[PDB]
Assembly symmetry: D2
Homo-oligomer: 295 residues x 4
């Protein structure tokens, strides 16, 4: 099956005076390209997909597809929804508008059964032909795509090729690849990028890469090159930034970090997201003072 | 402060051929109305708000308002979203179209901070001049509105009057009312309706009441009338059905039970929701046999 | 035959390492002087884990003699994660004048529900005094399931109920809806009233070390079905009830006793120890809200 | 620091007629030595430490010490307790009767604070002069030794050299080795042996090695040799046995498997442990027969 692996970036969606800032967005994607990043994920969790209108969401996917066209870099379009008909709609759009594949989050809030999860993803996979990456983030969704379901879907569906794991559970990671070595396990948690990669994971979808695309890109390629000494080295030194970028909900801290680095104009969120508390603000800028940020 | 309390129902949304069965929807509300229900909650979690379009969502509110108009049964409209701008738009439609107040779920999925939660609700509360009931269901949303935030919202916003608590945390309920006895604590967890009411809760927003509106109605009014022995009696009897209705994700069992009772024509959901396992179907069917289920 | 009502998990006071036995008697007298219906020598609040049998059994004796000739009963701590030990403890408490035993679920070793049944069955059959089960999964690492609690209650005459310390009011509804004959005892102070209002017949309290009159009043107002008054006290008590667990029980309660001049010295036996300076201030501050009894 | 690393086995404690089968114990330890284990852990959790008397506890250690004498195999004695005086008492015997070091579990049930955990272990480490390995298993104890606490103990106490981690938390394993690279991180969770080792872990204390000591020792040695591909392969192969060895509480499945393998005479537990459900019995037999088991 066709895949999208390697060092991938969960793009922040910068805001300017309320509206999506289409210049910085298309610009930041270029900064990711010119820094060793293999793929970009428009409008994921980090891109505030919840606060974006279906039009704005569709716009960002299109921008991402258009800024990358003609490069090595791929676009993994965030197409998740807790309503299957929307997710399909977002899936069909990405395909008909030229994304390489889609990252489809597990339905949040409505807590579907494993059966419902299977049919949800089957419907999405069987309405496009592009690679589909599952996304398991139970802390946010209130639901867990079981290994059984994940593997079931991988086998039943031609274009479902893996899962972005952000469940903090390395046991599940071993479980996945022990019973199903053919799948692409993607790290969805920055602090444990290395352990996932060292167990056969084939890439990451990073938040930290927004700030430090070089460090994250190198880590993954070192790990993929099976240079575990160097990949662990980077993972170890990135531990502090990886943890501090979650002292409050992503993408709050990362945007704050992208702001302090001059990479974006305004520290601007769409409610219910907001700027962090001053304490966590102090903690971020301090940790930032320990790394070399490029622009 | 103006409020909406008593026996309330988280209305299921019946589908027929994929579309909302509006006649059936109106009819189910009538059944709730005539069985002692004080207010109805169109399009909550139980009404599959996640998979309705904004237009269907708005229609269900219209149907609910139209059906309760003339009765003193209030319409507490589900207006929550994980986007403040959506939540405000929904809250404004609810106001403009006759809803007596709204129910606003804590933002799900995007895990806002307590600061973000406060501003999210303040923005909503300032948008309309009708009662706003907070909704805390951390198991679904991935976030918890802390007791302190709840009390701040209640004290800072004139139309925020309470919270539907669905966390299975009785300590929190004790915490809420020990510090702010003026707020309306609403049970959103059927199994423990009585413990919440008996600690000062002033109503329930029930899933069970779709099937047994009379029993839930009587439970709440016994409790509200301080007849705790009779309220507890009913709560104990309802424990079986109260648990079985969550053998899978609400509203999967309740809709199955409604279908089994002949109260809705077809057992249809919108994906990712679907019919329960054949086993749970049999378990629900078996548990129903222990209860007198009022018809239309 | 049962033990219900307002019960106190007695603290075990230390002076220079050894159990201050005069302080123990004075405290127990103080509990009796304030309407407490039963005392629990050597519970978790009594630091059973760090005591020797020489002391575990000294304490029980003192409890028996101090209560000898009053209406106040003695529910001895007699639990262990080893059945042969718990049986020995059960037999001791009996052979030494205890009116009943409190038996915690086996901690650490995580027995099955089958094992939990065979454990308690062997305990109840060893002695002829009533046995109160103790469920505190946050401490033990296991939970006695509702079915297991009910089976034990039905299969053994002297198993008459359970001290519940799981903060799960649903389980309390479950237990009393299916087995309304058992004595559900509250083991979490903050939610004493909601448990009592659902048919609970008593509390085994930490706060009643400090405020025995109020806890005794609460429990008795609820037994008389004056739920209005029981709720008032429960609400007044919430703050002290919560602060008494700002650190692990019995660290805050012993600190409070010390601050109230009720024990000689703030002395724990390791691994327990003094609270942080911060929590010391918190505890001291919270205490001011309350009128505290002397001897 | 004096250390004890490598492939280690949490020894089962076989009972015949209620008493510790001393001869079978030595026979099992001998089998471990022959199949390449680096250390054995007498009377830990798997050793049913909870139900053994002090006489038996000490007896088991001495058997482990005397069997390992004249070999490279070390004895890491289980010597934890949730009372510091008893833990020091246990520690003092283990040191005086041959054990190369002690494994000391975090105080269970009484939940001491981080400050308490520090003073607990400091009192242990400064009362005997043999290596001490911390044991963090919060699911059994109810408390967690924080990363900061572990590093403080490592730095302020000469003979504390690392921690057996059985919390299924790889993030914590990263935090530990990233801030204190001299830490001897030992896997205490068989299913994640490889991921812990691949991050700089220096050993395992295995339940599975009782049954398959060759595979566990091969896994650990491969990982220490930077041969991650082969170490992962084995870990992947062992995943199912590593998981079903916990369908019921350890050491219930492992002892069952050892009995069905003919490695011990009888399947006796001391209460509150007991024989598994007859269905879990067949489950264990099923999984074990999918592996190659060494005799004596
Ligand atoms: N805020 C809603 C709608 C999002 C529409 C697509 N960006 C949600 O998170 O599901
Ligand atoms: N599916 C989106 C939009 C729902 C719109 C109708 N309530 C959500 O769950 O928020
Ligand atoms: N600390 C040991 C011994 C307690 C002795 C008194 N029962 C335990 O809790 O198991
Ligand atoms: N049940 C006690 C007994 C300890 C005796 C020495 N192993 C405990 O686990 O602490």
């Amino acid at each position: 099956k066709n895949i999208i692996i390697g060092a991938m970036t969960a793009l922040i969606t910068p805001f300017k005076n309320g509206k999506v800032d289409e210049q910085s967005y298309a610009r930041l994607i270029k900064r990711q390209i010119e820094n060793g990043i293999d793929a970009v994920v428009p409008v994921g969790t980090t891109g505030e997909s919840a606060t974006l209108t279906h039009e704005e969401h569709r716009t960002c996917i299109e921008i991402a597809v258009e800024t990358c066209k003609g490069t090595k870099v791929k676009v993994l379009a965030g197409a998740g929804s807790n309503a299957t008909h929307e997710a399909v709609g977002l899936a069909k759009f990405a395909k008909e508008h030229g994304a390489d594949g889609i990252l489809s989050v597990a339905p949040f809030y409505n807590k579907p059964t494993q059966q419902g999860l299977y049919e949800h993803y089957k419907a999405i996979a069987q309405s496009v032909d592009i690679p589909v990456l599952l996304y398991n983030v139970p802390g946010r969704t209130g639901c867990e795509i079981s290994t059984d379901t994940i593997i079931k879907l991988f086998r039943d569906c031609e274009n479902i090729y893996g899962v972005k794991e952000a469940s903090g559970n390395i046991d599940k990671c071993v479980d996945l690849l022990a019973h199903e070595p053919r799948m692409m396990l993607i790290s969805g948690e920055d602090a444990i990028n290395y352990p996932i990669l060292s167990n056969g994971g084939k890439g990451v979808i990073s938040v930290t890469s927004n700030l430090l695309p070089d460090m994250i890109s190198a880590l993954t390629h070192f790990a993929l090159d099976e240079n575990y000494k160097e990949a662990k080295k980077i993972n170890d030194e990135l531990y502090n930034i990886n943890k501090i970028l979650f002292c409050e909900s992503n993408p709050i801290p990362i945007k704050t970090a992208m702001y302090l680095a001059g990479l974006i104009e305004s520290l601007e969120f769409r409610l219910p997201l907001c700027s962090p508390s001053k304490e966590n603000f102090a903690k971020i800028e301090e940790v930032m003072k320990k790394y070399k940020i490029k622009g």
